[PDB]
C-alpha cells in the first residue's frame, strides 16, 4: 500500500458515461512518462475524473533490472552419430554394366535400402568401384560396383535449445496491475513493447551500457538436465563447419528423431571411404559439449558476473559488481482501458501514529497512519515534498506510506483526502542518517540500481552538539566555555614534570 513518483496522469481526455446503478464508467486514451525508480519501489498513474469524487490507480513495480539478451532466432540441435550401409554386386545381371549408367546418381537404383524407413534420416547415396574376379566373388574379370548409403542417428535423446543473439541490452521485470483488481508480471526490453494485455502497453528506455568484450555468443541450454552455457554459434540457416549448428533443426518433434524433411544439414560430415568389398565411415562432427569458449553456469566474462536467473523468458542474466547505475524511464501507452467510479462521497478521517526510518536515503522514511472509512476510495496524501496514494478499506484500519524528507526533524502539515473529505493531519518524529551500502566479499549482486543519492554529504551544525551539550542559546555558550576551561589547567600543570621526562636523555643517567 504505497506509491512514489506521481505523474497525476492526464485529464480532459476521458469520456464520461452513465447507467447501471451509479458506476459512471469511463474510457481513456493517452500517454505518460513514469520514472524508472529503484527496484523495490513503484511508480503509479493516479487517474482523475472531472465530475466524480473518486480515483483509481495504476502502479508499476520493478524487481530485477538485469542485463538479459535479445533473440534473433531459435533452433534445436540434436547430438548425432554416424551410420553407413553398403551393397556389393557382380557384373552379370542386366541392371548394372559400368558404375553409374547416367551422369549422376538418381533415386536409389535398388530396394531394401535404409532410406525408405521413418527413422533413417538424411542420406547421400553413392556408387564406387571395388575389387572383382575369382578372388573376390565375381564371375567377370572387371571391377565390381559398390553402392553405399550414409546417414546419422540419435540414440540416447538429449536435445539442445539455441538462440543466436548479440545485442545484450538492459531489461527488467515488472508487475503491472489494472485499476480494478488485476495483477500480471512480464518483462519489457529496452526498445520494444510488451504486447497489449487489457489496453496498457509499457516500454522501457535504458542508457545502453556497453559491455567490455562480447562477440557473437549464444546461450545454449539442455532440455533434460537444465545445464546452461555460453558458446559461439552461427546465425539461423547456414551451417559453417567448426561451431555448434551443423545439424540445424527447428521443431522439437523431429529433432530427437532426425527426419529427412523439416530441417537442413550440410555435407562433408559423414565422409565415407571404400574398402576392398565393404564401406565403413567415421564422423567428423563435434559435440556441443566441447567446441570453443564453452563456459558454464558461473562466469566472469568482462566486468559482469553472468549468473543464472530463474524466469520464463531469457534465462541468462548479467550483473554489475559494486553498485553502478542505469538512467532509464518507462512510457505507458493506454488505449481502451475502462475504469469505474463510485460517484458517491463518503466520510474519511484519520491521523498519523509515528514516522521512522532514514534521512535522505535509498528508501525514505515510513509514516504509519490510521484511517476510518466507509468506502473503497483512494487516498491522496500530499505534503510540501513528495505525495503518495494507496487504497483504503472498509471500517477502521492502518496503513504505511513512504515519504522522503531532508532534515533531522519533521513538523510539516499534510492535506490527506480520500474521495470527498479533504481534511488535515500532522507529522512528528526523529530521523537518522544512513549512508550508501558498501561492498562485502561473498555477495554476488544481481541488480542494476537506477538511482544513487550524492552531493549532500557534509557535517552540519545545531546537531553536532545536541547530544554533546544541553539545549538552549545561552547553554551552548556556557558549555563551550566550560569545555574550553576543562583541560587547559591540567595541560599546563604537567609542564613542571615535563622536564623530568624530557631532560633524562639530555642529562646524567
Amino acid at each position: 500500500e504505497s506509491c512514489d513518483e506521481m505523474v497525476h496522469a492526464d485529464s480532459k481526455l476521458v469520456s464520461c458515461r452513465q447507467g447501471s446503478g451509479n458506476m459512471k464508467e469511463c474510457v481513456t486514451t493517452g500517454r505518460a512518462l513514469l520514472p524508472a525508480v529503484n527496484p523495490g519501489q513503484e511508480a503509479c498513474l493516479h487517474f482523475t475524473a472531472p465530475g466524480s469524487p473518486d480515483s483509481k490507480c495504476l502502479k508499476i513495480k520493478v524487481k530485477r533490472i538485469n542485463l538479459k539478451c535479445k533473440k534473433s532466432s531459435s533452433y534445436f540441435v540434436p547430438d548425432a552419430r554416424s551410420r553407413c550401409t553398403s551393397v556389393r554386386r557382380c557384373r552379370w545381371a542386366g541392371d548394372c554394366q559400368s558404375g553409374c549408367p547416367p551422369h549422376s546418381t538418381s533415386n536409389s537404383f535398388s530396394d531394401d535400402w535404409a532410406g525408405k524407413m521413418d527413422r533413417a534420416g538424411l542420406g547421400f547415396s553413392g556408387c564406387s568401384d571395388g575389387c572383382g574376379g575369382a578372388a573376390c566373388g565375381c564371375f567377370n574379370a572387371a571391377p565390381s560396383c559398390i553402392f553405399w548409403r550414409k546417414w546419422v542417428e540419435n540414440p540416447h535423446g538429449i536435445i539442445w535449445k539455441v538462440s543466436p543473439c548479440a545485442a545484450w541490452v538492459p531489461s527488467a521485470v515488472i508487475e503491472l496491475t489494472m485499476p480494478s483488481g488485476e495483477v500480471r508480471t512480464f518483462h519489457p526490453m529496452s526498445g520494444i513493447p510488451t504486447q497489449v494485455f487489457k489496453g496498457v502497453s509499457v516500454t522501457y528506455l535504458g542508457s545502453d551500457m556497453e559491455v567490455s568484450g562480447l562477440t557473437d555468443l549464444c546461450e545454449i541450454e539442455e532440455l533434460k538436465s537444465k545445464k546452461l552455457a555460453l558458446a559461439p554459434c552461427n546465425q539461423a540457416g547456414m551451417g559453417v563447419v567448426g561451431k555448434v549448428g551443423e545439424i540445424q533443426c527447428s521443431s522439437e518433434e523431429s529433432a530427437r528423431t532426425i527426419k529427412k524433411d523439416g530441417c537442413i544439414w550440410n555435407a562433408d560430415l559423414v565422409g565415407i571411404e571404400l574398402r576392398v568389398d565393404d564401406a565403413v565411415c567415421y564422423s567428423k562432427i563435434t559435440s556441443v559439449e566441447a567446441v570453443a569458449n564453452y563456459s558454464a553456469i558461473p562466469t566472469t566474462i568482462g566486468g559482469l558476473r553472468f549468473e543464472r536467473s530463474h524466469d520464463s523468458l531469457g534465462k541468462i542474466s548479467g550483473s554489475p559488481l559494486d553498485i553502478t547505475a542505469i538512467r532509464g524511464s518507462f512510457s505507458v501507452n493506454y488505449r481502451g482501458l475502462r475504469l469505474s467510479l463510485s460517484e458517491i462521497t463518503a466520510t474519511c478521517t484519520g491521523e498519523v501514529t509515528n514516522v521512522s526510518g532514514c534521512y535522505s536515503c535509498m528508501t525514505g522514511a515510513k509514516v504509519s497512519i490510521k484511517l476510518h472509512s466507509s468506502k473503497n476510495s483512494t487516498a491522496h496524501v500530499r505534503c510540501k515534498g513528495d505525495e503518495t496514494a494507496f487504497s483504503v478499506l472498509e471500517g477502521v484500519h492502518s496503513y504505511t506510506v513512504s515519504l522522503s524528507f531532508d532534515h533531522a526533524v519533521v513538523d510539516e502539515q499534510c492535506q490527506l483526502n480520500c474521495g470527498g473529505h479533504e481534511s488535515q493531519v500532522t507529522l512528528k518524529g526523529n530521523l537518522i542518517f544512513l549512508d550508501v551500502p558498501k561492498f562485502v566479499d561473498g555477495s554476488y549482486m544481481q541488480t542494476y540500481h537506477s538511482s544513487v543519492p550524492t552531493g549532500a554529504n557534509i557535517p552540519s551544525p545545531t546537531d553536532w552538539l545536541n547530544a554533546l551539550f544541553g539545549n538552549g542559546l545561552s547553554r551552548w555558550i556556557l558549555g563551550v566555555i566550560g569545555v574550553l576551561l576543562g583541560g587547559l589547567a591540567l595541560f599546563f600543570l604537567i609542564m613542571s614534570l615535563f622536564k623530568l621526562g624530557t631532560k633524562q636523555v639530555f642529562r646524567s643517567r
Binding site: 551410420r83 552379370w92 524407413m117 561473498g442 541488480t447 553536532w464
Partner: protein, 501 residues
Amino acid sequence: SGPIICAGPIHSNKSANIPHLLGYSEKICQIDRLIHVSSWLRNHSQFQGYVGQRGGRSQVSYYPAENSYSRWSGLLSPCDADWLGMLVVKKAKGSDMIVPGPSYKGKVFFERPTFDGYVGWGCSSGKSRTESGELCSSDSGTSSGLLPSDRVLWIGDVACQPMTPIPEETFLELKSFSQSEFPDICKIDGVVFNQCEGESLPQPFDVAWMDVGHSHKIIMREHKTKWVQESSSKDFVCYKAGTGPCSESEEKTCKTSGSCRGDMQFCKVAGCEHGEEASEAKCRCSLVHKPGEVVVSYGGMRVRPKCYGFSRMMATLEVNPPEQRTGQCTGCHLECINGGVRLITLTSELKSATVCASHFCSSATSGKKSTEIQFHSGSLVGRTAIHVKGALVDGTEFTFEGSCMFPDGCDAVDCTFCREFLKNPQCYPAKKWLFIIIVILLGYAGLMLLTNVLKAIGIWGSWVIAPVKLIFAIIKKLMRTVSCLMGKLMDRGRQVIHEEI
C-alpha cells in the same frame, strides 16, 4: 524377364490332378506355370480350378510395384521354397491382422511373412476380396472357371535360399543386440520383445528382416550385404528344345559322363567333351540368370541367411505418462543470523537460488544443504519481506516468503563518514567525548608549535643564501659600468685622432 523354363500354361481340365514329380528340374519347370498356388488351394481350400490363366509367372502383381528382386528370375519366392522342402507355411490364424496395403478388390489369394513365419489368405469358389479385406464377397465375375495371373498377390520383396546352420550361442547375441537399437518397440503381433508394462494401438511399419531358422526371425535396420555367384556343384536347371526338361537319369549322368553339349560356362566345369556330332543335343543349356547368394556382415560375425526380405509389419509403441511433478520443497524454513538470511533445504541439495531482499538481490553459493547468503553490509535495517525463488536438483521449482527482525537505528561503524553527520546514537553514545578531547588536545599541541616559530622565525637561517644570490646579481649589475667606459674611451680617442682636420 520371368520366362524361366517355358511359356505360360493353358490347361483344359475343370479339375485336374497335378501329379507330384521327383526331378528337381521338373519341379523348377513346374513352378513357372503358377501351380504352387493351385496346389495350396486344391489341397486345403477345397476350391476347384486353376490360377494363372495364360499369364505365366512374370505377370504376378507385387504390392511394392516398381521394386528390386523382380527384374531377375532366379530368385525363389517363399511359395517356391515351401514346395521345395523348407519349413511349412503356417495355416491362417484369426489373431493375425491384415496390413492396410494395396487395393484388394479383384484379388483371390495373397500371402504375408510374419514374425513367426509365413501366412496366406484366400477365399472359396465364387467369392473374392473386397476393397478393404475383411470378408469374402460373392461376385458373378469370378464364375467362368478361369482366374488370370494378376489375381494372385504377393506382399513385399523377399529372397530365400539354402543356408548353413549356426550354433545357438552365436544367435542369441544377435537378438539382444537388435533389441538395443529400438528402445520403443515392446510387443509385435502378440510376441513379447521387452517389458514396458503398457501397450498401444498397433500401427504399420515397413522394415527389413533376416531369417535364421532358430527363433522369431531378426529385424534389420543397418547391415552390409554381399552377393556371391558361387555356382559350385548344382546351380543350373535347363531343358531340351521344345519337349521341355530332360529325364532324371540324363541329369544324373550328365554331371559324371563324357560328351555333353552345353554353354561354355557349364563346359568349363562339368567336364565336357567335343567331337563330330549332329543335331542330337543332349539337354544343352547354360547358367540360370540370378545375381547369386547373399551374406550378412553385422558387426563382426557373418552368417548366410535362410531368407532375406523387406516388407510391412504390425507393431506397437511404448507409451508413458511422465507428467507428475513434485511441488515445492518439503517444510523449508527461513532464518536470519547476521546481515543475511540462511536457507534450509531438506528434500535434497540446493542447485541455485535467488534471494530478493527489500532493495537488493543476491545469488546462493549452491552445493550444500544449509547454505548461507550474505547481502551488502550497511543497509538491512527495519522490517523486510524476504522472498526467495529457486530450483533444486531432480527438477523441482520452489518459492518461499518470510521475514525477521533487524536493527532499526543501529549502524555500528568505527570511524568513517557514517558518524560525523550522526552524533546522537553513534553506536556507543559515550563516544563523542573521546573525539572531542583528542581533537582539542591536538589543537592545543598544534598551535603551541606556532608561537615558537613566531618568536623564533625559522626563515632567517635561509636569510644567508639569498643575500649570496643578491650579491651575484649586484656584481652583474655593476659589471656593465666598465664596458661603457672602455669602449667609449676607444671611440673618443679614435674620434680625437681624426678630429684634427
